[PDB]
Amino acid sequence: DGYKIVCYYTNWSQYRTKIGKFMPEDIQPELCTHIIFAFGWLKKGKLSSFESNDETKDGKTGLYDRINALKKANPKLKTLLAIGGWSFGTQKFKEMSATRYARQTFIYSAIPYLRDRNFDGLDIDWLYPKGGDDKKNYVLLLKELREAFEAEAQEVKKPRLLLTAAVPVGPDNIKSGYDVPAVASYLDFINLMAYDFHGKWERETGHNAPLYAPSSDSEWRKQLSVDHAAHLWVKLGAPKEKLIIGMPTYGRTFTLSNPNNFKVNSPASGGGKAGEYTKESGFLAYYEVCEILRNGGAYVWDDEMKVPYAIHGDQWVGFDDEKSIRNKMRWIKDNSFGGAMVWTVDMDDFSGGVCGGNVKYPLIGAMREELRGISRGKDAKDVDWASVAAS
Numbered sequence: 146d147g148y149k150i151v152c153y154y155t156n157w158s159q160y161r162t163k164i165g166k167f168m169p170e171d172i173q174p175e176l177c178t179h180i181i182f183a184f185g186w187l188k189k190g191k192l193s194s195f196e197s198n199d200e201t202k203d204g205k206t207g208l209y210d211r212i213n214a215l216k217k218a219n220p221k222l223k224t225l226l227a228i229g230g231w232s233f234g235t236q237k238f239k240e241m242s243a244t245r246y247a248r249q250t251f252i253y254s255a256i257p258y259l260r261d262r263n264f265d266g267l268d269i270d271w272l273y274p275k276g277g278d279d280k281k282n283y284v285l286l287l288k289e290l291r292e293a294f295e296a297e298a299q300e301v302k303k304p305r306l307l308l309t310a311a312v313p314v315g316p317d318n319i320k321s322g323y324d325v326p327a328v329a330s331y332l333d334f335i336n337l338m339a340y341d342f343h344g345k346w347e348r349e350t351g352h353n354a355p356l357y358a359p360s361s362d363s364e365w366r367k368q369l370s371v372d373h374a375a376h377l378w379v380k381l382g383a384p385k386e387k388l389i390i391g392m393p394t395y396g397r398t399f400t401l402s403n404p405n406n407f408k409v410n411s412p413a414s415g416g417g418k419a420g421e422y423t424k425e426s427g428f429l430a431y432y433e434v435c436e437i438l439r440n441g442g443a444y445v446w447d448d449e450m451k452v453p454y455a456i457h458g459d460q461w462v463g464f465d466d467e468k469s470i471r472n473k474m475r476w477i478k479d480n481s482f483g484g485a486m487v488w489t490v491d492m493d494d495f496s497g498g499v500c501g502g503n504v505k506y507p508l509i510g511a512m513r514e515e516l517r518g519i520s521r522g523k524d525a526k527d528v529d530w531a532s533v534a535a536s
């Protein structure tokens with residue numbers, strides 16, 4: 146194939162208002178190599194629909210089909226259905242993976258659920274397995290998924306269902322839940338969630354996803370970087386080419402205790418203000434940060450972490466822009482990784498009119514440029530935030 150651009154689509158972006166309202170049709174069919182639908186759900190231990198909107202029933206197409214319709218314009222595109230995520234909790238996953246009967250019950254529900262809806266594979270987003278029991282059962286679930294997927298592919302003579310998983314970057318989390326060598330052997334590839342290294346759960350300011358940890362940081366702290374985390378999965382037994390490194394189209398926000406101290410690892414009095422469209426304190430969509438910059442926000446590039454943050458009053462945002470991204474893509478190329486994962490496709494300037502470069506998908510578009518050599522076309526150019534906004 147080459148390098149992968151795996152984009153996560155979220156079915157709750159449909160509920161956003163004005164510039165943030167996102168429908169599947171807002172995805173260019175050749176933007177990504179894989180689209181992962183977030184999320185499916187679990188019910189009675191079986192793969193089920195999150196809510197009716199995703200399913201098509203009344204002769205009105207649901208979100209599943211509206212997504213998978215993208216494969217008509219681009220046959221080479223692959224779609225997966227992801228189950229889990231944060232809001233899903235762990236308890237249901239523990240119970241599903243507990244016994245072989247519990248697992249197989251899930252597995253044999255999943256395969257027809259996926260085929261009947263024209264999905265090409267399955268993404269397991271259990272956050273996270275924890276303890277020695279989960280560590281074993283997590284592996285068992287992946288193994289038995291792989292086995293069955295394989296068997297089915299041969300019986301029905303179709304290309305095999307893909308099996309993937311989103312996995313964490315917190316060293317603690319990893320050690321405690323993931324038999325990495327085996328976990329990787331059964332997955333087709335690995336979505337490394339190289340983000341949420343820092344957030345409103347901390348009394349300090351920190352970047353959502355630095356490539357390298359600052360000098361300001363503590364040595365134990367220094368472990369928190371996209372570079373350390375990724376190399377840590379290779380060290381534990383993961384194949385380089387199965388690692389798809391996560392890239393955030395969102396930023397984690399803070400409120401400065403004192404707006405005069407706006408440097409990274411400054412004291413913060415809690416999370417930053419909610420975005421107007423995302424409506425959740427502690428983060429903003431990249432297009433929501435563009436608005437801040439284009440309305441008096443100051444921009445700062447941290448040449449240590451190779452990522453930027455922005456400030457407006459006592460509001461502090463760590464994010465990724467085209468400069469931050471590209472540098473990362475080169476990093477991927479350099480370390481020979483599988484490609485890029487993107488959380489999310491719906492929080493990039495998908496419309497083209499917000500950040501101001503008049504280019505749809507400036508970020509993921511730049512990932513596809515660097516990794517797969519496909520121009521954003523025309524004369525589109527990175528917005529040069531430095532000059533554009535105050536310091």
Ligand SMILES: CC(=O)N[C@@H]1[C@@H](O)[C@H](O[C@@H]2O[C@H](CO)[C@@H](O[C@@H]3O[C@H](CO)[C@@H](O[C@@H]4O[C@H](CO)[C@@H](O[C@@H]5O[C@H](CO)[C@@H](O[C@@H]6O[C@H](CO)[C@@H](O)[C@H](O)[C@H]6NC(C)=O)[C@H](O)[C@H]5NC(C)=O)[C@H](O)[C@H]4NC(C)=O)[C@H](O)[C@H]3NC(C)=O)[C@H](O)[C@H]2NC(C)=O)[C@@H](CO)O[C@H]1O
Pocket residue numbers: 153157229230231232233270272311312313314315316338340341342343344346347369395423424425428488
């Ligand atoms: C005690 C202490 O100090 N502990 C520290 C420890 O916490 C630190 O470690 C860090 O911890 C934090 C939280 O404790 C971790 O944060 C979680 O990180 C995971 C990834 O590992 C995130 O999950 C994936 O990433 C995306 C991005 O967040 C997730 O997207 C979220 O998904 C949820 C639901 O799935 C969305 O909820 C939706 O909210 C909207 C808005 O209101 C609502 O309308 C929707 O209805 C609702 N969803 C539904 C289904 O209804 C949420 O919006 C979205 N976030 C977005 C879009 O920005 C997604 O779940 C995961 N992706 C895939 C793929 O599965 C998780 O979100 C995140 N949680 C929180 C609360 O932040 C962090 O990962 C962890 N990092 C590290 C490095 O450890 C450590 C380090 O400082 O120190 C300890 O001391």
